[PDB]
Amino acid sequence: CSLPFLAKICQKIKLAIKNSVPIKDVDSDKYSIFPTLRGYHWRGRDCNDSDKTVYPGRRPDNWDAHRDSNCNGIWGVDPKDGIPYEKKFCEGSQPRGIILLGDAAGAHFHIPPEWLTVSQMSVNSFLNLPTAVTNELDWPQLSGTTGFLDSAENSIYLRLRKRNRCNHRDYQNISKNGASSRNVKSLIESLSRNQLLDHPAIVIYAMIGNDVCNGRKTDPVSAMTTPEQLYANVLKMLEALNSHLPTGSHVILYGLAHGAFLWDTLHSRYHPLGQLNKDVTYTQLYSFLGCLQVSPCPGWMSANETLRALTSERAQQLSETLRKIAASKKFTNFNLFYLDFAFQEVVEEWQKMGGQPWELIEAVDGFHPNEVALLLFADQLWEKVQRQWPDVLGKENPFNPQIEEVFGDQGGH
Amino acid sequence: DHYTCVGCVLVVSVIEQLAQVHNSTVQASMERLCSYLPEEWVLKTACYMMVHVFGADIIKLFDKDVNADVVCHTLEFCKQEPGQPLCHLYPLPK
């Protein structure tokens, strides 16, 4: 990238990444007809990419008598009574979208172990490589909050769609691998919601590790976000959200991860690259990446158990700061809730299904929750919110069967 | 630099382990690896091109069987940076 003509190309690419909006977006409404490059793997597919006033989550102009302005597949008029279908079937159902402000776990970062495990490698092992790369090695379309494809327990979005079919396609995964409270402001800008013209939304803020997982070149403890910084960062983010979200929205602050689980579970187990000759464990992976100063979480991926404990203590302190914000600060356009990171519940749910805890962590990176873990976290969030704050999720739409009868798959995803 | 080291160790690891499971040379496993890439993106073509043009020149640097850490340090993909410890993923002999 140092060559002069080639560098102007490199700068342009990085610029597309960082803005976190689809590259294929003719009307610039941040929704795409193409899946990757921040396309409809990440947000609802644009049912008209030639019209910035047609996109998922919109309130339906004229009740969508003439066209499907919010891409939920419901539109037209019932010739029988002259009533628009979306008024008949959705008026009063309180639709809402789901928006994730998250990190690599929320984007569902995953390197296929098939790319690195020769014992099973074949012509089929790399067919997914171009999709994965142009999705920044994330798989939002299979994630726990916004997934909509056949899971390799289903996603928050699909549960919302099941509760009220009018929510079809109203998902947005605004997650970035390196996101934390320190940079969530750039994500707020890539979000799509008009406070007056769109449906309300559930926004989950789930930065579960990066505020304690920096420090790749210094004492990690000195690099971690402090409670005062996070308080300020999140407050400013919430104030910004208050100007985007329609009245009747809901914001959930999710606590940080129990990252000590990683070393405890994996330090003696073999990495995929170590399986053939039984010569690489996660201990060596963690040392290797740390030595190269590219560790994704030096504080928790350490053999120094004092460092791990300090990292966990900061994580708990930052989670208590989120809980304090939710208990003490109020915003006109949304209700605000805090939820703890449901570590014990997920691990117990998994063990009762016959699982082993090491099966919950991405095999290649030894860091992120994997697809199963993410759907278990989604299940625990759904049930807990349903039990405590059922208003957040809304009522079941009694006209879901009518919607299905008249509109079928509602245009698919 | 710290990324090229990681990427080199990953790629060389796969090449070496793929050779091991087939009792093959490194040239044969490199070609086998390209064989597995998808046609899209000119990956398989770029791969094959890379292997034929430079492969042998790279293998000829080695009169001994050595692991991926050694290969990648020799090719200067893993450099010993001033003030930083030597990095390696696999066990050291002795």
Ligand SMILES: *O[C@H]1[C@H](O)[C@@H](NC(=O)C[C@@H](CCCCCCCCCCC)OC(=O)CCCCCCCCCCCCC)[C@H](OC[C@H]2O[C@H](*)[C@H](NC(=O)C[C@H](O)CCCCCCCCCCC)[C@@H](OC(=O)C[C@H](O)CCCCCCCCCCC)[C@@H]2O)O[C@@H]1CO[C@]1(C(=O)O)C[C@@H](O)[C@@H](O)[C@@H]([C@H](O)CO)O1
């Ligand atoms: O320029 C910016 C940097 O790019 C940016 N770094 C990135 O964000 C990290 C990227 C770099 C990608 C390099 C490799 C590219 C090739 C990928 C294509 C795949 C080809 C197949 O990395 C990634 O995000 C992960 C990529 C892993 C790729 C592995 C592929 C394996 C496939 C095997 C193929 C074999 C075939 C046979 C930098 O950001 C600063 C920090 O920001 C936070 C970020 N943290 C997160 O992203 C953490 C998140 O949870 C993701 C963790 C992923 C861990 C993967 C482990 C894999 C182990 C594999 C087994 C051994 C930090 O990043 C890291 O934590 C990521 C980690 O370090 C990477 C580990 C392994 C790399 C392997 C490379 C393999 C190469 C391909 C092999 C062929 C970031 O450090 O920021 C700079 C710009 O910066 C600054 C600025 O200049 O202004 C300065 C900063 O200090 C900072 O201040 C910010 C400011 O704050 C902004 O305001 O900006």
Ligand SMILES: *[C@@H]1O[C@H](CO[C@@H]2O[C@@H](C)[C@@H](O)[C@@H](O)[C@@H]2O)[C@@H](O[C@@H]2O[C@H](CO)[C@@H](O)[C@H](O)[C@H]2NC(C)=O)[C@H](O)[C@H]1NC(C)=O
């Ligand atoms: C997607 O929308 C385009 C554009 O819609 C027109 O322009 C918008 C900005 C808005 O003003 C809409 O009300 C307009 O209908 C549609 O393209 C137009 O379609 C009509 C035929 O119904 C035709 O008169 C125009 O020539 C078309 N093109 C333009 C540039 O106006 C298009 O049909 C929509 N696609 C789908 C699948 O519904």
Ligand SMILES: *[C@@H]1O[C@H](CO)[C@@H](O[C@@H]2O[C@H](CO)[C@@H](O)[C@H](O)[C@H]2NC(C)=O)[C@H](O)[C@H]1NC(C)=O
């Ligand atoms: C375990 O990690 C901790 C935290 O990084 C280390 O504590 C630091 O020790 C160095 C001295 O070598 C000082 O720079 C800091 O004052 C310490 N940090 C804190 C927060 O007290 C500790 O040295 C590590 N232990 C081992 C055996 O490596």
Ligand SMILES: *[C@@H]1O[C@H](CO[C@@H]2O[C@@H](C)[C@@H](O)[C@@H](O)[C@@H]2O)[C@@H](O)[C@H](O)[C@H]1NC(C)=O
């Ligand atoms: C091949 O090499 C064998 C030793 O390697 C082991 O067995 C082979 C089949 C692979 O699975 C490899 O990964 C193992 O480490 C020898 O036993 C055998 O004699 C060799 N084959 C020939 C034809 O010489």
Ligand SMILES: CCCCCCCCCCCCCC(=O)O
């Ligand atoms: C014998 C084969 C040698 C293997 C070479 C693979 C090198 C991978 C380089 C990784 C890319 C680094 C990206 C970056 O610098 O940002």
Ligand SMILES: [Ca+2]
């Ligand atoms: Ca669009």
Ligand SMILES: [Ca+2]
């Ligand atoms: Ca549109």
Ligand SMILES: [Ca+2]
């Ligand atoms: Ca509609």
